[PDB]
Amino acid sequence: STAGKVIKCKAAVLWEEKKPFSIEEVEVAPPKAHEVRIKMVATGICRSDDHVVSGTLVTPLPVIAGHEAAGIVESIGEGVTTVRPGDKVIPLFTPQCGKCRVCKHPEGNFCLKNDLSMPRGTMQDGTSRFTCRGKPIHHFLGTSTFSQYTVVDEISVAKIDAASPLEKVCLIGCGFSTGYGSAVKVAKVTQGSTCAVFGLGGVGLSVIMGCKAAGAARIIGVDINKDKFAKAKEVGATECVNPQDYKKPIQEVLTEMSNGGVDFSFEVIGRLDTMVTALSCCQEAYGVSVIVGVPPDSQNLSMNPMLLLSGRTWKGAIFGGFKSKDSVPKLVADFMAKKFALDPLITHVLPFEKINEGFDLLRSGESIRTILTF
Amino acid sequence: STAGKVIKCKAAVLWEEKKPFSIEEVEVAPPKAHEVRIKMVATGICRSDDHVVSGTLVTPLPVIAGHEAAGIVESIGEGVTTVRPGDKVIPLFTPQCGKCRVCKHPEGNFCLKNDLSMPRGTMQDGTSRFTCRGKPIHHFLGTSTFSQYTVVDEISVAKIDAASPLEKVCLIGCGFSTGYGSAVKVAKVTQGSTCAVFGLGGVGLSVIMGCKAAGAARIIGVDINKDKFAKAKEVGATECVNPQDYKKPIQEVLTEMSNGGVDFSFEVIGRLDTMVTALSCCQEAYGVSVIVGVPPDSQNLSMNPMLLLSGRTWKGAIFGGFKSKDSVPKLVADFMAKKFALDPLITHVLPFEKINEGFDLLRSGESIRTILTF
Numbered sequence: 001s002t003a004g005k006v007i008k009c010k011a012a013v014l015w016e017e018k019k020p021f022s023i024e025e026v027e028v029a030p031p032k033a034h035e036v037r038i039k040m041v042a043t044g045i046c047r048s049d050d051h052v053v054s055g056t057l058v059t060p061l062p063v064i065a066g067h068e069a070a071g072i073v074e075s076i077g078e079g080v081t082t083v084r085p086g087d088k089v090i091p092l093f094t095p096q097c098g099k100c101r102v103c104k105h106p107e108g109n110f111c112l113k114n115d116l117s118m119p120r121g122t123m124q125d126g127t128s129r130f131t132c133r134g135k136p137i138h139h140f141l142g143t144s145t146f147s148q149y150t151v152v153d154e155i156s157v158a159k160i161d162a163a164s165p166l167e168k169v170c171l172i173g174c175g176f177s178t179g180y181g182s183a184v185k186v187a188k189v190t191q192g193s194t195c196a197v198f199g200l201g202g203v204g205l206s207v208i209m210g211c212k213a214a215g216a217a218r219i220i221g222v223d224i225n226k227d228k229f230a231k232a233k234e235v236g237a238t239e240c241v242n243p244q245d246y247k248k249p250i251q252e253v254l255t256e257m258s259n260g261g262v263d264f265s266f267e268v269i270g271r272l273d274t275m276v277t278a279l280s281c282c283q284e285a286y287g288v289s290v291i292v293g294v295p296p297d298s299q300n301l302s303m304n305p306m307l308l309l310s311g312r313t314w315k316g317a318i319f320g321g322f323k324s325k326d327s328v329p330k331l332v333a334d335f336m337a338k339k340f341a342l343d344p345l346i347t348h349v350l351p352f353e354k355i356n357e358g359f360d361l362l363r364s365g366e367s368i369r370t371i372l373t374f
Numbered sequence: 375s376t377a378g379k380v381i382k383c384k385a386a387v388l389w390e391e392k393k394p395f396s397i398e399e400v401e402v403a404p405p406k407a408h409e410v411r412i413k414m415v416a417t418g419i420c421r422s423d424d425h426v427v428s429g430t431l432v433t434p435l436p437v438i439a440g441h442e443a444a445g446i447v448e449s450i451g452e453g454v455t456t457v458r459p460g461d462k463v464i465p466l467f468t469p470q471c472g473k474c475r476v477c478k479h480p481e482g483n484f485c486l487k488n489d490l491s492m493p494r495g496t497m498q499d500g501t502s503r504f505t506c507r508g509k510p511i512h513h514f515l516g517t518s519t520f521s522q523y524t525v526v527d528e529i530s531v532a533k534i535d536a537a538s539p540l541e542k543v544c545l546i547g548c549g550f551s552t553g554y555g556s557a558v559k560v561a562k563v564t565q566g567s568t569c570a571v572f573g574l575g576g577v578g579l580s581v582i583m584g585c586k587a588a589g590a591a592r593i594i595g596v597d598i599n600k601d602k603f604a605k606a607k608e609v610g611a612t613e614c615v616n617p618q619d620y621k622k623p624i625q626e627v628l629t630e631m632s633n634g635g636v637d638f639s640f641e642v643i644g645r646l647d648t649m650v651t652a653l654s655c656c657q658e659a660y661g662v663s664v665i666v667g668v669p670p671d672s673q674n675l676s677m678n679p680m681l682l683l684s685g686r687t688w689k690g691a692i693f694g695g696f697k698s699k700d701s702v703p704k705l706v707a708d709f710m711a712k713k714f715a716l717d718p719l720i721t722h723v724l725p726f727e728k729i730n731e732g733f734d735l736l737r738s739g740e741s742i743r744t745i746l747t748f
């Protein structure tokens with residue numbers, strides 16, 4: 001039925017920052033050319049969604065948030081090649097437009113049609129496919145996955161394995177792929193290496209997995225919160241260190257530990273102090289350090305250029321440096337091949353109406369990942 | 375004759391910081407095992423020598439400075455394989471001990487027996503091969519090339535082409551190799567790229583050459599001093615920009631200029647402001663920025679981690695990232711093959727007694743490179 005007609009469904013609208021989400025009856029306009037309209041099956045709650053609500057991530061409001069998700073294609077607009085109705089898909093918040101500077105370049109993945117650099121909160125043609133009582137609602141990072149139906153451009157949707165468990169592969173739409181990509185594709189962790197992962201939330205557990213996929217022979221997990229160590233161990237940390245156990249610095253007790261500093265170091269905490277710390281405790285002449293994520297209101301860090309002079313490399317990346325359309329298929333194919341288990345990372349699944357309930361957990365921190373089922 | 379006996383020669387001694395060099399009669403003890411004693415032919419004056427004299431580079435005084443140089447082997451101590459008397463050689467201030475962490479690693483070059491990290495000012499066994507009137511004089515970075523004869527360990531000497539012009543290949547002992555290595559071996563400048571070189575002193579002209587050897591199709595030279603542009607052009611700058619010409623920022627007028635920021639950017643000025651500037655104007659999703667050199671008294675820069683988040687890489691290196699024993703031979707072989715010309719970079723050659731005269735020029739800056747002939 002639906003094909004061609006507007007749909008009317010529930011979605012969570014942030015009418016204004018620092019207020020809760022409201023479940024609203026929403027109308028989802030039909031796809032124009034090169035658009036696909038998706039039926040959502042499961043959406044993860046990521047801190048970047050919550051960043052919107054504090055005003056930290058400035059995007060046009062009112063907004064439908066969500067970017068981590070898998071669903072099923074309902075209609076496809078005119079001129080769409082990549083997908084067909086009924087295909088399981090993952091919305092992509094890093095688009096893969098194919099034609100730009102960054103898209104042709106063999107290591108750039110951060111597509112030039114991204115809506116992060118300057119958020120407009122619209123579809124590629126400057127308009128919204130959403131209205132709640134006449135009022136337009138903005139799109140978020142071209143995905144808006146906290147809606148029961150959503151419309152994405154063809155550069156922001158990736159087709160995946162029809163037998164794939166959508167209540168687990170939705171993690172590949174952001175959180176797992178951002179961390180595993182940092183170990184596997186951005187730092188290019190090598191077999192035998194000694195990796196230090198800073199912070200052990202769900203993206204950190206993904207990094208540990210990357211390191212493990214790459215064959216590091218030592219993955220030290222570090223966290224001031226002792227309670228994170230078991231799951232980390234479970235997922236690949238050979239050891240785990242709590243910074244408040246020592247009297248010494250941590251970069252000292254890590255280089256000491258490692259006979260000269262670790263090969264690769266990753267910061268999945270997101271703060272300034274440990275970013276620079278994570279620089280100093282990877283090897284002086286060839287250590288590589290990846291800032292997996294940095295929050296939207298970041299200030300300037302003070303770092304002494306001298307730490308680069310001996311040969312350290314310092315990289316940053318969005319989405320694990322993966323080219324989105326290219327990789328999310330292969331990461332599901334892999335998950336289907338029984339390599340990663342997204343299972344240790346899912347600690348709560350709620351129904352989609354408990355969206356605000358899913359954020360309170362995020363915000364008090366005992367939740368690795370919450371999945372919202374539709 | 376000499377072989378085995380102490381030699382007595384003139385060398386320039388820094389008896390104490392922030393004083394001039396004195397030509398002193400010096401005695402050069404014979405080589406112990408794995409030492410070679412060199413007869414100096416030409417030594418370049420580098421700012422790192424001058425850094426010693428201000429106290430900025432702290433090393434034990436009294437000292438014989440010098441590290442950029444080529445000479446001829448006079449005796450070789452017991453157990454020396456790599457060299458024979460009469461071989462033209464280049465002292466290496468970055469040793470290549472063969473056995474360590476950094477020496478086996480396929481990209482680390484900063485040997486673990488380096489005397490920069492913690493200067494002792496001695497030969498590898500904790501002692502000096504120099505005494506001026508009974509008083510011991512310290513060795514500098516295991517080279518001490520401002521002496522008419524010097525003793526170096528076998529890990530710090532590289533054999534080169536016997537037909538090689540030593541009054542020009544002495545530059546490969548530091549200044550040229552530090553800059554060309556940054557473009558060729560550290561950033562790995564690719565064919566077609568757009569490079570921005572910051573600062574256009576002699577190391578900067580070397581970078582321009584690297585970029586040129588790598589095949590960049592645009593090398594923008596930038597310098598507040600207009601007068602540096604011709605030689606730069608001459609050596610490969612396709613254009614040159616003076617920052618005081620614009621009203622805009624320079625990273626803006628460079629990314630603007632480059633349709634999205636340059637591929638590779640290099641800072642050969644050595645200050646904090648342009649290091650961070652040179653970060654921002656190479657491409658957001660895959661731009662690479664190399665700090666070629668950072669002075670010894672460096673403070674902390676303030677940089678917003680956000681510039682790494684999109685995919686920029688920021689590297690530092692010592693000696694152009696080259697493994698010293700390995701490469702200095704191949705860089706002479708290349709120079710012998712009429713590829714680089716060290717000639718644009720040599721702007722003054724003095725006799726070795728005018729050492730202080732050679733530094734005043736360094737210090738007022740109109741001198742690309744001064745060579746001191748022995």
Ligand SMILES: NC(=O)c1csc([C@@H]2O[C@H](COP(=O)(O)CP(=O)(O)OC[C@H]3O[C@@H](n4cnc5c(N)ncnc54)[C@H](O)[C@@H]3O)[C@@H](O)[C@H]2O)n1
Binds near residue numbers: 271294296
């Ligand atoms: N904003 C971003 O783009 C982004 C990506 S990752 C990131 C940071 O990570 C969080 C999301 O990633 P995540 O899955 O790890 C969730 P979380 O916020 O739980 O990540 C932080 C982790 O670091 C640990 N920790 C906190 N401070 C220290 C410290 N000083 N030293 C050592 N360990 C510490 C915490 O226990 C936690 O495990 C965000 O809240 C933010 O703080 N921000």
Ligand SMILES: NC(=O)c1csc([C@@H]2O[C@H](COP(=O)(O)CP(=O)(O)OC[C@H]3O[C@@H](n4cnc5c(N)ncnc54)[C@H](O)[C@@H]3O)[C@@H](O)[C@H]2O)n1
Binds near residue numbers: 577578617670
């Ligand atoms: N200490 C180190 O390890 C090291 C390596 S390179 C380096 C810096 O470079 C010098 C040695 O290298 P070099 O051959 O280039 C000699 P120089 O000191 O001449 O290098 C600095 C160059 O940058 C230019 N310049 C100065 N400020 C600016 C500015 N703000 N913006 C743009 N251009 C500017 C100068 O005209 C000059 O050409 C050292 O004095 C130091 O200042 N230090």
Ligand SMILES: [Zn+2]
Binds near residue numbers: 047049068174
């Ligand atoms: Zn996210």
Ligand SMILES: [Zn+2]
Binds near residue numbers: 095096112
């Ligand atoms: Zn693109």
Ligand SMILES: [Zn+2]
Binds near residue numbers: 420421422442548
């Ligand atoms: Zn030097």
Ligand SMILES: [Zn+2]
Binds near residue numbers: 484
């Ligand atoms: Zn070594």
